[PDB]
Amino acid sequence: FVEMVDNLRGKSGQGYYVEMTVGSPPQTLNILVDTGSSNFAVGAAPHPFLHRYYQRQLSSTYRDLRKGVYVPYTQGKWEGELGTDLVSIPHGPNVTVRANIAAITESDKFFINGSNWEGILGLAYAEIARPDDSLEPFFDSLVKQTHVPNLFSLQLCGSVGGSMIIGGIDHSLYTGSLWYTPIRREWYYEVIIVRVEINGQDLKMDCKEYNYDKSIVDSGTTNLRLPKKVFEAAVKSIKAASSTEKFPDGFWLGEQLVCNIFPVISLYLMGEVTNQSFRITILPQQYLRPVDCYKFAISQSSTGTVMGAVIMEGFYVVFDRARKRIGFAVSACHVHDEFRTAAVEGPFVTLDMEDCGYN
């Protein structure tokens, strides 16, 4: 998997993209790697922000599905025309598959002005695919049509770079051992957090709060998002541990910027074995992001916990779809200092972990 190493590029806060080819002859596009969605959607019209776009008229292998798709998000929206075409990943496996492609024809607050990507690769499951679950996601098409193993792994390094290893794991990308947490349900990459520690101090909350209404691993989100009740308890603990310096209330709410004092954040995840868990620890270097101007990258959420780039940049993350599990290991590229480092530690004894999941 040497040729797949360093195949990700991007800019801080703008996500991580991979080079892909679409159609025949192949059209080169930069595509956002997103484990928090399930559609392969690409710009297909000359939007001013786009360096390039999918030109269906130039592709002999393009097939029209004669169906539209409208996708509104919490913020922003895109509308596309559905079809299929031959797709390949130059710095991935040496294969070409026929995959569903949403040709984006209209959008608002979707593409980022100044970004170098013009499409999105939804790596999650068909359950959250749009318009419905009958539209096969790219990775499902990839596994069905080739002998590529049903697994991919991500090393996101905090302009920015990283690696997407398709069909396997590269052991040079991590130190120590991988620790696996079960995928609760195949829609998002849903996991269960069982305990949260701020500087080794437990929040003492009902663990069901940590996963209300869900907890997901999402490469297409910058922040570590937490449920409001968990967020206000977490922020209060972070306020106390950094009592040396005083910061405005707007800073903690992500309404303003700030220009050893900050605590580590540990998330205990459900293990592979009954009553067994493991913990992942992130540093201030992960949740205090440069914009020296810094933005507090922990925010309140209405859709549950989102383990975004804040979490993922500290670790090598294995999306083991074949075994319905997600592996975490200390990243060989994560940003740290001489006193503290990101950690993956286990095993720990945690009881009533099934009560933490919301139904």
Phi, psi of 4 (to 5 degrees): -90, -10
- Fill in the per-residue mask, 201 to 230: x = in contact with ligand 5QV (CB under 6 A), - = not in contact: -----------------x-xxx--------
Query: In this structure, how many other beta carbons lie within 10 angstroms of the beta carbon of residue 81?
Result: 18
Structure-token pair, residue 37: 């969605």
Q: Is residue 102 involved in binding ligand 5QV (CB under 6 A)?
A: no
267 CB-contact burial (10 Å; exposed 0-12 / middle 13-18 / buried 19+): buried
Residue 162: phi and psi, rounded to 5, are 165, -175
CB of 215 to ligand 5QV, least distance (A): 14
Site for ligand 5QV in 28-47 (CB under 6 A): 32, 34, 36-37
What phi and psi, each to the nearest 5 degrees, are found at residue 284? -55, -30
Query: 3-state DSSP helix/strand/coil percent for the chain, to nearest 5?
Result: 15, 40, 45
By beta-carbon proximity to ligand 5QV, the closer residue of 59 and 153 is 153
Radius of gyration of the chain (CA): 20
Q: Between residues 34 and 136, which has the closer beta carbon with respect to ligand 5QV?
A: 34
Q: Choose which of 102, 120, 151, 207 interacts with ligand 5QV (CB under 6 A).
A: 120
Q: Which is closer to ligand 5QV, CB of 123 or CB of 165?
A: 123
Nearer to ligand 5QV, 17 or 278 (CB): 17
Q: How far is the CB of 111 from ligand 5QV (least distance, A)?
A: 7
The angle subtended at Cα 64 by Cα 62 and Cα 68, nearest 5°, is 130
Between 222 and 281, whose beta carbon lies closer to ligand 5QV?
222
Of the candidate residues 5, 45, 95, 112, the single one contacting ligand 5QV (CB under 6 A): 112
Instruction: Tell me which stretch binds ligand 5QV (CB under 6 A): 72-80, 153-161, 276-284, 344-352.
Output: 72-80
What residues between 147 and 166 interact with ligand 5QV by CB under 6 A?
Answer: none
CB atoms within 10 A of CB 75: 8
Size of the site for ligand 5QV (CB under 6 A): 17
Dist CA 25 CA 92 (whole Å) = 18
Instruction: For residues 247 and 267, give the distance between their C-alpha atoms in angstroms, rounded to a whole number.
Output: 25
String of DSSP letters for 64-126: EEEEEEEEE-SS-EEEEEEEEEEEE-TTS-S-EEEEEEEEEEEEES-S-TT-S--EEEE-S-G
Using the CB atoms, write b or e for 114-141: b if 16+ within 10 Å. ebebbbbbbbbbbebbbeeeebbbbbbb
CB of 218 to ligand 5QV, least distance (A): 5
Residue of 1, 53, 54, 110 that binds ligand 5QV (CB under 6 A): 110
Determine if 14 is a binding residue for ligand 5QV (CB under 6 A).
yes
Catalytic positions: 34, 218
In the complex, the smallest distance separating the C-beta of residue 52 from ligand 5QV, rounded to whole angstroms, is 17
Taking alpha carbons only, the member of 213, 240, 238 closest to residue 228 is 213
Q: Does 74 bind ligand 5QV (CB under 6 A)?
A: yes
Q: Toward ligand 5QV, which CB reaches closer, 36 or 304? A: 36
Closest CB 334 distance from ligand 5QV, rounded Å: 18
Please return the burial class of 225, using the count of CB atoms within 10 Å of its CB with bins 0-12, 13-18 and 19+.
Answer: buried
Q: Is 73 in the site for ligand 5QV (CB under 6 A)?
A: yes
- Determine the Cα–Cα distance for residues 40 and 319; give it in Å rounded to an integer: 18
Residue 62 vs 189, nearer CB to ligand 5QV: 189
| Interface with ligand 5QV (CB under 6 A), residue from 57, 75, 134, 302 | 75
**Under the rule (CB under 6 A), what is the footprint of ligand 5QV?**
14-15, 32, 34, 36-37, 73-76, 110, 112, 120, 218, 220-222
